């Protein structure tokens, strides 16, 4: 990317999810005249983020690859997926950390 | 890594430590603001409504005590009574989605007793299976075919599930409904659904206000009561026409005679003014010459919709008052901050809060306006 | 009635060294008055182990009652037992509240916890032992119940 910044005088680096803004100037050597993030002035809470750390049985859950074949973790994710599918009206997207992890979990869920 | 025990004691008692009339007025004014705008929108007095109820596994949920099935059925009975009291000429039909199929429980007719009885029987039936909007809509589409053209087709789906299992493409049914001029009102129970929103919007000429999801038990009754009133029609749609009808005369007879409607012995009845056939009750289509028999009172009940009484505006406190007592009920206005006087624009006569609600809900004519001599 | 007994909380303290009980206090004037009494027999003095109950009752008789507090965090000379509740285990609301009162100030204090039969006093005791992180000895009424405590 060195030729790009040396050639073009003005570059607009924009993205919906890009933070921290101070890393890219460090990781990619370039200087920024302006850099900021805009908060959304929304009348009501349009999105409800949540950080689930435990299952119903109050057992910690993590997707560490070395404990992927753990019945406790696998079941808690499985129950979580079902519960959100029951209350979700139309669409539900599930993102796994790696494809191999997705295969192992799905196979365990099928059994 | 100390636990919460070692930190401190909660000290619950520390949390507790030791204008209403104006609040009610401003709250009423805010509520009255929604009622300020009123215009005589043309509404179809004659209507045919197909009531679709969801009887599926989703009804077994205990969100609405005791269960969704019980509350929906119970409020349906009240809706049937209210619907036929405000609109006497209208006819209604009942459908239920159960076991993935739409099951007819009462033919489209104008007798409230038949629909009430059908709902009563459904009480014991245990909901099961998945709902099917397409099956209910296709059955509703067929039911609304024989209805006369002048009648405004209406469908009131009470949907409770979040997913629909259809045998075909439901989008085709939505297009078909628009072709037949059928308007669908959906009362969701849990959350918004993409197909339900599209069905209501497409069939209501793009209006998105006909799909409502309640938020508590109390709101359900308000949603049910709202559907009782007739819906306005769009300018582009044209259905102007005349309908032949007659007013029979009640006949008293010493000896009972056979009824043409049910072929049963009844002491009294109404003699048709065309074929002289006797009918047990009104208002129903004559069993012989198929002209809808009605009384003048049935038409009268719907007049207030055509010309609604204009909403009253609270008088400012600074301005003087016409009198110290209510014009109609003669109840002294409390001295109290803000004067609690409401005057009708046409006749300029103050009214109390009790009269304001009464004169716009039950009584549909301002007492002062009738008293004023022209 | 409330005023009289709400001021004697923390004048006299009792601590336990290696195997000798020292009834000491930070201040020096008050203990001198206590020592003058013939019944008992910064200042710290070793008291006979057998006669510990006698002084404890006597302190209750006198205006100042004896306090029983032990700062388990500070002292590490006594070997510490490494134990913690299992991840699956969860403390019930009332059990959490009952144990919170014992450790309200962050230091364990002796007392009696009364819960209805079946409430789970065994788990309350287990949690109390775990947090202190010291040697724990359990005395139980019957051998059958001793097996229950072990399990
Ligand atoms: N937090 C808990 N979750 C589940 N079971 C519990 C819990 N706490 C206590 N129990 C149960 O309570 C029962 C009685 O406990 P125990 O300590 O013997 O009661 P007691 O107060 O009579 O000594 C046991 O079966 C135990 O497993
Ligand atoms: F109070 Be328990 F039954 F030990
Ligand atoms: Zn009859
Ligand atoms: Zn006739
Ligand atoms: Zn009045
Ligand atoms: Zn008036």
XYZ file of C-alpha atoms and ligand atoms in Angstrom:
671
model
C 0.000 0.000 0.000
C 3.019 2.329 0.017
C 2.620 3.256 -3.690
C -1.080 4.011 -3.186
C -0.593 6.661 -0.501
C 2.397 8.214 -2.288
C 0.520 8.465 -5.600
C -2.918 9.765 -4.589
C -2.984 12.893 -2.435
C -6.415 12.359 -0.842
C -7.586 8.954 0.411
C -10.831 8.334 2.314
C -10.635 5.191 4.459
C -14.198 4.515 5.614
C -15.867 1.436 7.065
C -18.905 0.634 9.168
C -16.877 -1.360 11.729
C -13.297 -0.072 11.904
C -11.669 0.422 15.306
C -9.404 1.373 16.933
C -8.672 4.055 14.339
C -5.106 4.501 15.640
C -3.969 0.981 14.688
C -4.269 1.288 10.896
C -1.913 4.298 10.720
C 0.544 2.191 12.734
C 0.051 -1.164 11.002
C -0.122 0.610 7.625
C 2.351 3.494 7.480
C 0.341 6.614 6.662
C -0.706 9.862 8.329
C -4.293 11.033 8.792
C -5.404 14.661 8.864
C -8.762 13.722 10.411
C -10.121 10.575 12.044
C -13.283 10.093 14.098
C -16.268 7.820 14.688
C -19.895 8.960 14.617
C -22.412 7.946 17.262
C -25.906 7.221 15.941
C -28.667 9.476 17.289
C -31.478 6.916 17.466
C -34.895 7.567 18.988
C -35.135 4.049 20.442
C -32.689 1.200 21.002
C -32.676 -0.395 17.554
C -30.104 -3.061 18.487
C -29.662 -5.079 21.688
C -26.089 -6.363 21.997
C -25.455 -8.976 24.668
C -22.355 -10.873 25.783
C -23.400 -14.364 26.856
C -20.784 -15.932 29.132
C -22.702 -18.847 30.698
C -25.382 -21.367 29.819
C -28.619 -22.110 31.615
C -26.732 -24.439 33.982
C -24.397 -21.560 34.970
C -21.393 -23.167 33.252
C -18.854 -21.036 31.404
C -18.837 -21.478 27.623
C -15.961 -20.783 25.240
C -15.053 -21.791 21.686
C -11.429 -22.686 22.422
C -10.370 -25.109 19.702
C -8.707 -27.529 22.142
C -11.988 -28.205 23.998
C -14.274 -28.173 20.960
C -15.410 -31.758 21.635
C -16.624 -30.952 25.150
C -20.194 -32.149 25.856
C -20.866 -29.287 28.280
C -19.800 -26.520 25.888
C -21.366 -28.200 22.851
C -24.732 -28.686 24.551
C -24.857 -25.121 25.898
C -24.318 -23.710 22.405
C -26.892 -26.157 21.057
C -29.486 -25.115 23.626
C -28.658 -21.456 22.978
C -29.220 -21.876 19.237
C -32.576 -23.592 19.771
C -33.849 -21.008 22.259
C -33.032 -18.068 19.983
C -34.613 -19.921 17.054
C -37.868 -20.290 18.997
C -38.224 -16.545 19.663
C -36.629 -15.201 16.457
C -39.399 -14.392 13.943
C -37.812 -14.706 10.491
C -34.008 -14.617 10.288
C -31.158 -15.894 12.464
C -27.504 -15.841 11.398
C -24.910 -17.893 13.295
C -21.195 -17.174 12.793
C -18.594 -19.760 13.813
C -14.907 -19.009 14.463
C -13.621 -21.503 11.896
C -15.096 -23.908 9.370
C -13.552 -26.935 11.088
C -15.160 -25.811 14.347
C -18.506 -25.506 12.556
C -18.244 -29.055 11.199
C -17.420 -30.604 14.578
C -20.197 -28.753 16.414
C -22.823 -29.566 13.780
C -21.859 -33.248 13.800
C -22.134 -33.337 17.595
C -25.494 -31.553 17.453
C -26.829 -34.074 14.935
C -25.980 -36.975 17.250
C -10.265 -12.882 44.031
C -12.548 -12.056 46.926
C -16.213 -12.938 46.616
C -19.165 -10.575 47.001
C -19.598 -11.622 50.643
C -16.425 -9.877 51.814
C -17.108 -6.547 50.082
C -19.919 -5.031 52.182
C -23.566 -5.440 53.181
C -26.263 -4.362 50.739
C -28.036 -2.133 53.301
C -31.404 -2.246 51.572
C -32.908 0.366 53.903
C -30.406 2.931 52.594
C -32.176 2.923 49.221
C -35.457 4.084 50.776
C -35.288 7.615 52.189
C -37.878 9.985 53.639
C -49.271 18.366 41.153
C -51.275 15.199 40.515
C -54.380 17.111 39.416
C -52.463 19.158 36.836
C -50.675 15.970 35.773
C -54.040 14.376 34.983
C -55.116 17.409 32.939
C -51.934 17.514 30.852
C -52.069 13.730 30.475
C -55.682 14.071 29.331
C -54.681 16.878 26.960
C -51.952 14.686 25.460
C -54.464 11.854 25.100
C -57.070 14.321 23.828
C -54.543 15.451 21.206
C -54.936 12.151 19.351
C -58.712 12.688 19.509
C -58.509 16.304 18.297
C -58.307 15.293 14.622
C -61.578 13.795 13.371
C -63.192 14.017 9.938
C -66.206 12.196 8.459
C -64.303 9.563 6.507
C -66.602 7.450 4.352
C -66.922 3.956 5.823
C -68.574 0.825 4.491
C -71.493 0.105 6.805
C -72.216 -3.262 5.180
C -69.272 -5.621 5.625
C -68.352 -9.309 5.681
C -65.596 -10.279 8.125
C -63.857 -13.668 8.214
C -62.302 -14.202 11.650
C -59.206 -16.419 11.505
C -57.831 -17.697 14.818
C -54.510 -19.464 15.348
C -54.937 -22.792 17.169
C -51.434 -24.282 17.162
C -48.690 -25.300 19.573
C -47.846 -21.608 19.991
C -51.181 -21.173 21.793
C -50.026 -23.464 24.618
C -47.636 -20.745 25.818
C -48.508 -19.159 29.166
C -47.725 -15.576 28.132
C -51.437 -14.721 28.432
C -52.930 -16.349 31.513
C -54.110 -19.061 31.604
C -53.023 -19.787 28.035
C -53.202 -17.962 24.719
C -55.961 -20.250 23.439
C -58.295 -19.497 26.350
C -57.883 -15.713 26.260
C -58.220 -15.498 22.471
C -61.385 -17.612 22.482
C -62.908 -15.677 25.387
C -62.193 -12.278 23.834
C -63.489 -13.622 20.515
C -66.895 -14.147 22.138
C -66.895 -10.526 23.299
C -65.800 -9.352 19.847
C -68.649 -11.300 18.231
C -71.172 -9.652 20.553
C -69.706 -6.175 20.054
C -69.273 -6.611 16.296
C -72.923 -7.536 15.708
C -74.219 -4.842 18.080
C -72.473 -1.931 16.355
C -72.951 -3.379 12.849
C -76.297 -5.225 12.575
C -76.328 -5.716 8.807
C -72.845 -7.242 8.613
C -72.143 -10.969 8.345
C -69.229 -12.862 9.854
C -67.396 -16.151 9.492
C -64.990 -18.086 11.688
C -61.920 -20.080 10.629
C -59.218 -21.741 12.732
C -55.714 -22.878 11.774
C -55.014 -26.280 13.326
C -52.867 -29.292 12.412
C -51.396 -27.346 9.504
C -54.806 -26.919 7.854
C -57.553 -24.309 7.865
C -60.751 -25.709 9.386
C -64.115 -24.013 8.928
C -66.164 -23.822 12.128
C -69.088 -21.597 11.076
C -70.524 -20.613 7.701
C -70.550 -16.927 6.815
C -73.907 -15.689 8.106
C -75.508 -12.788 9.957
C -76.629 -14.610 13.103
C -74.409 -13.819 16.126
C -75.707 -16.856 18.026
C -74.267 -19.302 15.487
C -70.805 -17.734 15.692
C -70.912 -17.556 19.494
C -71.873 -21.232 19.697
C -69.084 -22.209 17.296
C -66.503 -20.407 19.434
C -67.915 -22.016 22.585
C -67.407 -25.488 21.108
C -63.808 -24.640 20.181
C -63.090 -24.052 23.887
C -62.375 -27.697 24.701
C -60.390 -28.343 21.516
C -56.683 -28.574 22.299
C -54.498 -26.588 19.861
C -51.787 -28.563 18.085
C -49.724 -28.571 14.919
C -48.399 -25.591 12.986
C -50.404 -22.670 11.568
C -50.874 -22.105 7.845
C -51.674 -18.574 6.688
C -52.092 -19.629 3.055
C -54.624 -22.338 3.912
C -56.600 -19.905 6.070
C -56.412 -17.172 3.427
C -57.412 -19.527 0.605
C -60.383 -20.721 2.663
C -61.213 -17.108 3.530
C -60.930 -16.143 -0.141
C -63.486 -18.794 -1.081
C -65.861 -17.790 1.709
C -65.868 -14.139 0.605
C -66.759 -15.018 -2.999
C -70.576 -15.434 -2.757
C -70.831 -12.215 -0.732
C -72.446 -9.365 -2.723
C -70.177 -6.871 -4.451
C -71.396 -3.887 -2.422
C -70.196 -5.630 0.742
C -66.637 -4.800 1.794
C -64.604 -7.978 2.215
C -62.633 -8.135 5.459
C -60.280 -10.644 7.094
C -59.153 -10.398 10.734
C -56.337 -12.877 11.398
C -55.318 -13.474 15.013
C -51.801 -14.834 14.501
C -49.817 -16.155 17.444
C -46.917 -18.144 16.020
C -43.655 -16.898 14.503
C -43.312 -19.310 11.555
C -45.770 -20.429 8.884
C -45.707 -23.740 6.996
C -47.506 -23.383 3.666
C -47.941 -25.955 0.873
C -47.560 -23.321 -1.837
C -46.208 -19.834 -2.539
C -48.058 -17.490 -0.187
C -47.032 -14.490 -2.305
C -49.461 -15.650 -4.996
C -52.292 -15.601 -2.450
C -51.415 -12.040 -1.422
C -51.661 -10.914 -5.049
C -54.944 -12.806 -5.415
C -56.366 -11.107 -2.318
C -55.558 -7.671 -3.750
C -57.332 -8.672 -6.966
C -60.467 -9.611 -5.000
C -60.283 -6.418 -2.882
C -59.837 -8.147 0.481
C -58.296 -6.248 3.402
C -56.461 -8.276 6.055
C -55.920 -7.184 9.662
C -53.388 -9.197 11.677
C -53.099 -9.132 15.480
C -49.727 -10.669 16.271
C -48.953 -11.987 19.733
C -45.154 -12.271 20.068
C -43.161 -10.373 17.435
C -43.256 -8.937 13.937
C -43.238 -11.318 10.967
C -42.078 -10.387 7.476
C -44.886 -12.150 5.606
C -47.599 -10.828 7.929
C -46.381 -7.253 7.464
C -46.355 -7.655 3.678
C -49.842 -9.185 3.626
C -51.367 -6.334 5.635
C -49.516 -3.605 3.732
C -50.269 -5.007 0.273
C -53.973 -5.565 0.968
C -54.477 -2.179 2.692
C -53.278 -0.028 -0.226
C -49.818 0.336 1.296
C -50.945 1.225 4.822
C -48.677 -0.350 7.448
C -50.915 0.438 10.444
C -53.122 -2.666 10.057
C -50.524 -5.055 11.544
C -50.415 -4.684 15.330
C -48.662 -6.731 18.016
C -49.907 -6.321 21.574
C -47.611 -5.707 24.540
C -49.751 -6.947 27.463
C -53.103 -8.517 28.306
C -54.867 -5.152 28.550
C -53.821 -4.015 25.069
C -55.439 -7.091 23.487
C -58.953 -5.918 24.393
C -58.334 -2.500 22.838
C -57.133 -4.145 19.618
C -60.208 -6.369 19.484
C -62.547 -3.458 20.118
C -60.915 -1.321 17.416
C -61.689 -3.862 14.681
C -65.402 -3.567 15.520
C -65.727 -0.183 13.824
C -65.907 -0.129 10.008
C -62.782 0.698 8.037
C -62.489 3.690 5.671
C -62.284 3.187 1.916
C -59.838 4.694 -0.557
C -60.791 7.332 -3.113
C -59.744 5.254 -6.128
C -61.853 2.250 -5.124
C -65.457 2.628 -6.295
C -68.350 0.558 -4.981
C -71.247 2.999 -5.087
C -74.512 1.149 -5.662
C -78.070 0.613 -4.451
C -79.303 -2.454 -2.564
C -82.921 -3.603 -2.559
C -84.316 -4.080 0.943
C -87.610 -4.026 2.796
C -88.863 -3.423 6.320
C -91.186 -6.211 7.542
C -93.873 -5.735 10.176
C -93.998 -7.737 13.394
C -97.083 -9.972 13.347
C -98.828 -11.402 16.411
C -100.646 -14.709 15.917
C -102.629 -16.845 18.343
C -101.570 -20.144 16.744
C -97.897 -20.883 15.979
C -96.920 -21.208 12.331
C -94.023 -22.715 10.415
C -90.997 -20.495 9.801
C -89.568 -20.357 6.289
C -86.027 -19.852 7.607
C -85.822 -22.913 9.881
C -89.122 -24.767 9.263
C -89.892 -24.733 12.990
C -92.950 -23.790 15.027
C -92.655 -20.225 16.351
C -95.477 -18.170 17.842
C -94.382 -14.908 16.229
C -92.225 -13.575 13.441
C -91.786 -10.917 10.785
C -93.796 -11.058 7.556
C -91.772 -10.246 4.460
C -93.145 -7.303 2.417
C -92.547 -9.150 -0.889
C -93.402 -12.851 -0.465
C -95.221 -12.623 2.899
C -92.958 -15.357 4.274
C -92.344 -15.244 8.024
C -88.813 -15.111 9.464
C -87.976 -15.851 13.095
C -85.462 -13.048 13.644
C -83.840 -10.037 11.992
C -81.725 -8.880 10.281
C -81.326 -11.756 7.809
C -81.716 -12.345 4.086
C -85.228 -13.521 3.301
C -85.215 -17.315 2.753
C -87.556 -17.003 -0.246
C -86.996 -13.743 -2.178
C -83.406 -13.188 -0.916
C -83.884 -9.501 -0.093
C -82.295 -8.453 3.186
C -85.008 -7.667 5.727
C -84.103 -4.994 8.282
C -85.686 -2.589 10.749
C -85.207 1.172 10.745
C -83.224 0.840 13.980
C -80.547 -1.265 12.272
C -79.834 1.552 9.817
C -79.960 4.106 12.635
C -77.164 2.484 14.644
C -74.684 3.215 11.836
C -75.590 6.884 11.273
C -73.183 8.200 13.913
C -70.240 6.760 11.961
C -71.158 8.834 8.902
C -71.317 12.126 10.852
C -69.195 11.788 14.003
C -69.631 14.419 16.698
C -66.772 16.919 16.637
C -64.363 16.621 19.550
C -64.579 19.167 22.360
C -61.730 21.559 23.152
C -60.887 22.438 26.747
C -61.540 26.095 27.537
C -58.583 28.239 28.663
C -58.536 29.077 32.355
C -58.219 32.823 31.737
C -61.395 33.098 29.659
C -64.717 33.421 31.456
C -67.133 30.508 31.820
C -70.702 30.336 30.539
C -72.080 28.939 33.808
C -71.036 27.355 37.095
C -72.765 24.011 36.395
C -72.718 21.465 33.589
C -75.353 22.166 30.948
C -76.494 18.556 30.591
C -76.022 16.798 33.941
C -75.793 19.919 36.160
C -72.628 18.920 38.016
C -70.658 21.786 39.531
C -67.219 22.219 38.011
C -64.649 21.856 40.824
C -63.012 25.155 41.725
C -59.567 23.552 42.051
C -55.273 25.445 38.649
C -56.876 24.676 35.273
C -60.612 24.913 34.647
C -62.161 21.523 33.857
C -64.693 22.826 31.336
C -65.200 21.518 27.796
C -67.420 23.409 25.350
C -68.887 22.178 22.079
C -67.787 24.345 19.159
C -71.155 24.379 17.389
C -73.268 25.530 20.353
C -70.591 26.914 22.721
C -71.858 25.283 25.905
C -69.549 23.922 28.583
C -69.562 20.267 29.616
C -67.943 18.223 32.369
C -65.440 15.394 31.959
C -68.090 12.715 32.515
C -70.288 14.230 29.804
C -67.332 14.589 27.424
C -66.656 10.843 27.471
C -70.363 9.971 27.494
C -71.293 12.380 24.685
C -68.625 10.855 22.412
C -68.827 7.125 23.275
C -72.416 6.127 24.131
C -74.544 9.181 23.360
C -73.858 10.400 19.816
C -75.522 13.833 19.843
C -74.484 16.932 21.761
C -77.351 17.939 24.096
C -76.692 21.632 23.503
C -76.824 21.353 19.719
C -80.305 19.810 19.756
C -81.491 22.415 22.272
C -80.298 25.304 20.102
C -83.230 26.592 17.994
C -82.393 27.367 14.365
C -32.429 -0.054 76.174
C -30.830 0.079 72.716
C -28.437 2.860 73.728
C -26.855 0.989 76.629
C -25.738 -2.130 74.759
C -24.669 -0.451 71.488
C -21.380 1.051 72.739
C -19.476 -1.935 74.205
C -18.868 -3.618 70.827
C -15.108 -3.459 70.344
C -13.199 -2.676 73.547
C -11.767 -6.119 74.426
C -10.351 -8.550 71.856
C -9.154 -12.157 72.036
C -6.621 -13.650 69.615
C -4.970 -17.058 69.280
C -1.225 -17.430 68.736
C 0.608 -20.720 68.102
C -1.203 -22.515 70.977
C -1.583 -19.702 73.544
C -4.629 -17.450 73.845
C -3.781 -13.753 74.251
C -6.644 -11.489 75.379
C -5.143 -8.238 74.115
C -6.298 -4.796 72.989
C -4.710 -1.894 71.130
C -5.426 0.525 73.977
C -3.644 0.105 77.306
C -5.808 1.947 79.853
C -9.011 -0.102 79.605
C -7.287 -3.479 79.973
C -5.648 -2.308 83.203
C -9.108 -1.884 84.726
C -10.047 -5.367 83.485
C -6.887 -6.956 84.904
C -7.501 -5.458 88.351
C -10.497 -7.773 88.744
C -9.609 -11.003 90.539
C -12.053 -13.018 88.408
C -9.672 -12.935 85.433
C -6.391 -14.735 86.079
C -1.351 -2.166 73.883
C -1.338 -5.070 76.353
C -1.303 -8.805 75.617
C -1.318 -11.546 78.254
C -1.528 -15.329 77.982
C -4.592 -16.871 79.644
C -5.032 -20.477 80.750
C -6.618 -22.518 77.969
C -8.949 -24.393 80.325
C -10.257 -21.185 81.939
C -11.045 -19.532 78.581
C -14.770 -20.194 78.976
C -14.729 -18.580 82.429
C -13.384 -15.265 81.127
C -15.690 -15.337 78.097
C -18.745 -15.528 80.352
C -17.198 -12.968 82.707
C -16.692 -10.501 79.853
C -20.392 -10.904 79.076
C -21.178 -10.236 82.743
C -19.037 -7.076 82.767
C -20.080 -4.082 80.668
C -17.678 -4.922 77.833
C -18.484 -8.229 76.071
C -15.799 -10.207 74.279
C -15.563 -9.902 70.495
C -14.658 -12.828 68.228
C -13.109 -11.659 64.951
C -10.301 -13.262 62.951
C -8.540 -11.627 59.985
C -7.871 -14.750 57.932
C -6.422 -12.704 55.053
C -3.571 -11.170 57.055
C -2.136 -14.285 58.730
C -0.348 -16.786 56.483
C 1.786 -18.566 59.101
C -0.829 -21.295 59.432
C -0.717 -23.468 56.285
C -3.473 -22.584 53.828
C -5.761 -25.167 52.225
C -6.346 -24.520 48.512
C -10.038 -25.244 47.915
C -12.821 -23.577 45.948
C -16.403 -24.273 44.948
C -16.888 -26.325 41.804
C -17.918 -24.381 38.674
C -21.274 -26.173 38.528
C -22.154 -25.195 42.097
C -24.201 -22.043 42.651
C -25.118 -20.447 45.978
C -28.824 -19.861 46.569
C -30.077 -16.344 47.400
C -30.749 -16.852 51.110
C -27.593 -18.943 51.502
C -25.620 -16.094 49.932
C -27.250 -13.556 52.254
C -26.622 -15.680 55.353
C -22.931 -16.099 54.529
C -22.646 -12.405 53.636
C -23.568 -11.392 57.190
C -20.731 -13.498 58.617
C -18.235 -11.848 56.231
C -19.862 -8.412 56.167
C -16.670 -6.562 57.109
C -14.425 -8.810 55.001
C -13.140 -10.671 58.080
C -14.627 -13.917 59.362
C -16.482 -13.694 62.671
C -17.858 -16.489 64.826
C -21.600 -16.951 65.086
C -24.598 -19.212 64.609
C -26.511 -19.464 61.322
C -30.073 -20.771 61.665
C -31.750 -22.063 58.504
C -34.782 -24.370 58.145
C -34.130 -28.092 57.802
C -33.320 -28.818 54.173
C -32.206 -25.230 53.552
C -28.659 -26.373 52.795
C -26.590 -25.499 55.853
C -24.026 -28.039 54.640
C -23.341 -25.920 51.555
C -23.194 -22.761 53.687
C -20.570 -24.399 55.886
C -18.642 -25.652 52.859
C -18.605 -22.166 51.334
C -17.535 -20.636 54.652
C -14.596 -23.043 54.846
C -13.593 -22.370 51.236
C -13.434 -18.582 51.590
C -11.331 -18.650 54.770
C -8.731 -20.839 53.017
C -7.401 -22.375 56.238
C -7.589 -25.717 58.021
C -11.198 -26.654 58.794
C -12.464 -29.122 61.408
C -16.074 -30.341 61.443
C -17.782 -31.718 64.554
C -21.057 -33.515 63.845
C -23.746 -35.114 65.983
C -23.713 -38.619 64.470
C -21.423 -40.846 62.426
C -24.101 -41.321 59.755
C -24.191 -37.546 59.335
C -20.379 -37.495 59.353
C -20.516 -39.661 56.231
C -23.053 -37.227 54.769
C -20.672 -34.335 55.449
C -17.818 -36.230 53.785
C -19.893 -36.992 50.686
N -27.609 -24.774 46.366
C -28.179 -25.976 46.368
N -28.606 -26.525 45.207
C -29.175 -27.736 45.252
N -29.400 -28.521 46.302
C -28.967 -27.949 47.438
C -28.362 -26.713 47.553
N -28.048 -26.446 48.877
C -28.463 -27.505 49.526
N -29.027 -28.457 48.715
C -29.583 -29.738 49.131
O -30.259 -29.561 50.348
C -30.379 -30.874 50.956
C -30.219 -30.749 52.453
O -28.963 -30.097 52.761
P -28.376 -30.221 54.250
O -27.147 -29.382 54.365
O -28.286 -31.663 54.624
O -29.533 -29.545 55.131
P -29.599 -29.186 56.706
O -29.770 -27.689 56.785
O -30.786 -29.929 57.262
O -28.295 -29.660 57.308
C -29.361 -31.779 50.233
O -30.051 -32.708 49.406
C -28.535 -30.812 49.374
O -28.037 -31.384 48.185
F -31.642 -29.224 59.708
Be -31.060 -30.470 58.969
F -32.137 -31.551 58.740
F -29.707 -31.009 59.451
Zn -87.196 -20.045 11.949
Zn -89.402 -12.463 1.122
Zn -71.889 16.861 32.728
Zn -72.960 21.179 20.833
